[PDB]
Amino acid sequence: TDRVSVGNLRIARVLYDFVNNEALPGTDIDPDSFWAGVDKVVADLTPQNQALLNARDELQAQIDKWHRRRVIEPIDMDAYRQFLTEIGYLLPEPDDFTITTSGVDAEITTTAGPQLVVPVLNARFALNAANARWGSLYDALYGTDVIPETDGAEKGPTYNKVRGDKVIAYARKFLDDSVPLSSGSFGDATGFTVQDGQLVVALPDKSTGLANPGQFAGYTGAAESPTSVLLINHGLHIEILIDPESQVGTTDRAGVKDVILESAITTIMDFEDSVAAVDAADKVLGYRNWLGLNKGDLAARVLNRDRNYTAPGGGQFTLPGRSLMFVRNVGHLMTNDAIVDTDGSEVFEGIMDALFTGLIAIHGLKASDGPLINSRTGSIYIVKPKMHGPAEVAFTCELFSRVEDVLGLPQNTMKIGIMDEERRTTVNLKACIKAAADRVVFINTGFLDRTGDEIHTSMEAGPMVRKGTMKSQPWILAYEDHNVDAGLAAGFSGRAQVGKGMWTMTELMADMVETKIAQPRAGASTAWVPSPTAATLHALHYHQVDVAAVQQGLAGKRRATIEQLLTIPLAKELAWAPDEIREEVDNNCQSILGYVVRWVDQGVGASKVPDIHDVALMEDRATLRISSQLLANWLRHGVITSADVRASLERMAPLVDRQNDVAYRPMAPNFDDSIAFLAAQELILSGAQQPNGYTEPILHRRRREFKARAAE
Numbered sequence: 102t103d104r105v106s107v108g109n110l111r112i113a114r115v116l117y118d119f120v121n122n123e124a125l126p127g128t129d130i131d132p133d134s135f136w137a138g139v140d141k142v143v144a145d146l147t148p149q150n151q152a153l154l155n156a157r158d159e160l161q162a163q164i165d166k167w168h169r170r171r172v173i174e175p176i177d178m179d180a181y182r183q184f185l186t187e188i189g190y191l192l193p194e195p196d197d198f199t200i201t202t203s204g205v206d207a208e209i210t211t212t213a214g215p216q217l218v219v220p221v222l223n224a225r226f227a228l229n230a231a232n233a234r235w236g237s238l239y240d241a242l243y244g245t246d247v248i249p250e251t252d253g254a255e256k257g258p259t260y261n262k263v264r265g266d267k268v269i270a271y272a273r274k275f276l277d278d279s280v281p282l283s284s285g286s287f288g289d290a291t292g293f294t295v296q297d298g299q300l301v302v303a304l305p306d307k308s309t310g311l312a313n314p315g316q317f318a319g320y321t322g323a324a325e326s327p328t329s330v331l332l333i334n335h336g337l338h339i340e341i342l343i344d345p346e347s348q349v350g351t352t353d354r355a356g357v358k359d360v361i362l363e364s365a366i367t368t369i370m371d372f373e374d375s376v377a378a379v380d381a382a383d384k385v386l387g388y389r390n391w392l393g394l395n396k397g398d399l400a401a402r403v404l405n406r407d408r409n410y411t412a413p414g415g416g417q418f419t420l421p422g423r424s425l426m427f428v429r430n431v432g433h434l435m436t437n438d439a440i441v442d443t444d445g446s447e448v449f450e451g452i453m454d455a456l457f458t459g460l461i462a463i464h465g466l467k468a469s470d471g472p473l474i475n476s477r478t479g480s481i482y483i484v485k486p487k488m489h490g491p492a493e494v495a496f497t498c499e500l501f502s503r504v505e506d507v508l509g510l511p512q513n514t515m516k517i518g519i520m521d522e523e524r525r526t527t528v529n530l531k532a533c534i535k536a537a538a539d540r541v542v543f544i545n546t547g548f549l550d551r552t553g554d555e556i557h558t559s560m561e562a563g564p565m566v567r568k569g570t571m572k573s574q575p576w577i578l579a580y581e582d583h584n585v586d587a588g589l590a591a592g593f594s595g596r597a598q599v600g601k602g603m604w605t606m607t608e609l610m611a612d613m614v615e616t617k618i619a620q621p622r623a624g625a626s627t628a629w630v631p632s633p634t635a636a637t638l639h640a641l642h643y644h645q646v647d648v649a650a651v652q653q654g655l656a657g658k659r660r661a662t663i664e665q666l667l668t669i670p671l672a673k674e675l676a677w678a679p680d681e682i683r684e685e686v687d688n689n690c691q692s693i694l695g696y697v698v699r700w701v702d703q704g705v706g707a708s709k710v711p712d713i714h715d716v717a718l719m720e721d722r723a724t725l726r727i728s729s730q731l732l733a734n735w736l737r738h739g740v741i742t743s744a745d746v747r748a749s750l751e752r753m754a755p756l757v758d759r760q761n762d763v764a765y766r767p768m769a770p771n772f773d774d775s776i777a778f779l780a781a782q783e784l785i786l787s788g789a790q791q792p793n794g795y796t797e798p799i800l801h802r803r804r805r806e807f808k809a810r811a812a813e
């Protein structure tokens with residue numbers, strides 16, 4: 102064929118060659134021993150992987166039946182709770198404990214700041230994301246709606262000085278709020294100098310230093326007239342660039358050219374919900390980019406070097422120039438035919454990701470032909486998504502342990518960022534953390550997947566509230582607080598990240614700056630952003646909120662009950678008028694179609710899709726999971742008919758065709774000839790039958806179908 106036999110496995114040649122020629126050289130792992138290890142790990146752990154997936158199905162069957170066999174008024178919470186305990190869904194809560202994870206980098210244990218997620222299959226985006234550790238505040242302010250485009254302040258083809266002056270003024274207020282002067286305001290500064298190791302800021306009438314001189318972290322250039330001044334606040338760096346000859350510095354009262362913020366402290370290179378990878382060719386593209394990131398030679402533009410500074414006293418030092426990288430592996434569900442066994446059965450994809458992304462990450466622990474690219478403390482950081490409960494966490498740990506043995510790595514090298522994005526994890530979160538107590542480096546509320554699981558788990562209970570109502574429902578507010586509580590109770594402060602979820606409105610940056618501050622105010626040491634620009638703007642929130650102090654104030658508090666976590670988001674009687682149902686259907690169909698068409702026809706796993714209100718939303722599989730499950734639920738309970746669904750899909754499809762484009766194939770009017778349209782339809786009409794409402798089985802099948810037809 103086009104496969105390589107190793108034991109019981111038949112490996113796609115493209116993957117075999119990539120591993121031997123690109124991934125293995127430089128790790129000192131023997132190629133034959135590696136492939137024997139792949140065979141042995143797959144054979145040994147596949148049964149447990151399948152058993153865990155079977156357990157999800159059996160628990161969900163019981164829950165479906167339970168709802169179908171009830172007539173009572175609102176749900177008897179006491180009966181529901183004891184039922185879930187009976188079936189093993191709700192497990193006992195373990196005694197208090199503190200995590201023991203060691204060898205973790207400061208960016209994770211100590212620094213509070215933004216965490217950027219990027220599809221690993223897009224080399225250009227991945228490079229920008231790794232370089233997003235530092236970003237221009239002026240560019241982020243000028244280029245977005247944070248500075249309103251009011252009369253006279255609009256963006257044009259050329260620089261608008263009125264707008265630029267608003268940018269400068271915004272940044273000066275940020276400096277006053279973050280690194281205050283002893284007296285006066287940065288808005289009146291006329292220059293900066295370093296005198297006896299102290300920062301001196303010239304005012305019109307006088308000179309002043311910092312109210313806290315310890316916030317002066319360094320400078321570049323001559324101490325007499327530095328080319329830049331480096332400050333620190335809440336552990337994050339701020340750099341004032343001084344250049345009176347620049348276009349902006351010429352207009353500035355102190356010659357300031359820009360303010361650079363330490364922004365994306367860590368970055369998650371994603372193999373999961375933001376990428377479309379359905380075969381060996383796709384996986385190799387992703388693995389090769391992850392390899393180039395860890396070897397430091399990925400080029401599309403290149404990775405940045407570390408940044409050199411002079412210390413206040415005069416010594417030299419350096420700061421990391423790149424975001425510390427995690428990789429998000431796929432979860433336990435899917436198989437991939439990149440490897441098949443002798444029976445033709447596909448191998449579990451999460452098992453493969455652990456082996457291959459783990460192998461590749463070794464390069465980030467060693468010098469790059471300069472210094473090693475990633476973890477100086479010797480860890481490999483893997484986000485494991487979509488786990489359901491503590492036995493599934495234990496399985497990830499065993500998989501990582503077995504992979505470490507194959508790779509010759511110390512035990513516990515491979516650390517786990519746990520997504521809390523499935524109900525059976527939420528309600529057993531303390532036990533999930535305990536199961537990974539020596540590997541865990543974060544917990545994070547993946548609230549979009551979590552909403553998808555909320556809908557599917559209770560699918561039989563009745564019609565759910567509209568998608569937009571979900572973000573304010575009791576269950577989700579309890580879930581967010583419960584996650585923070587569990588992390589802090591497990592000793593996460595100073596040891597691991599407590600993270601919150603993604604901002605998806607990529608153009609609504611004024612709204613992000615106004616509202617996303619709630620996440621660090623809730624004690625999250627990190628939260629997810631969709632772009633380098635949004636990382637720079639979200640960094641402002643960490644200068645305003647002292648997350649370390651917030652976490653200390655939250656200690657010992659139990660702010661969510663199990664009853665709150667289990668409050669199902671059922672709609673009340675007579676909740677909606679016909680126009681509101683119409684808008685919900687059309688909005689969900691447009692978002693489904695806009696995302697699925699680029700997935701199936703172009704293999705793009707994350708797309709900006711305008712919604713029914715013309716708001717650009719960054720869509721990935723989790724937002725698709727919500728929209729498809731909600732419509733499945735409304736169809737299941739008679740809120741809408743199958744004619745309503747088909748009509749909405751047919752009405753929104755031509756609009757999506759218009760929004761798109763070199764490789765774009767219109768879906769309309771030949772709907773049944775478009776694999777993408779049929780995939781969108783199947784996601785709704787078959788949604789109730791998909792395991793835990795997951796979208797990958799349909800998406801993968803339909804993308805492979807598209808590729809097959811295109812190859813003739």
Ligand SMILES: Cc1ccc(C2CC2)cc1C(=O)/C=C(\O)C(=O)O
Nearest residue numbers: 218374375547548549550707721723
């Ligand atoms: C929803 C979403 C949008 C965009 C991106 C990336 C930037 C492309 C990631 C996610 C995501 O995966 C979130 C969660 O895992 C989860 O809330 O379930």
Ligand SMILES: [Mg+2]
Nearest residue numbers: 522547550723
């Ligand atoms: Mg998710």
Ligand SMILES: [Mg+2]
Nearest residue numbers: 335644646647
């Ligand atoms: Mg403070």
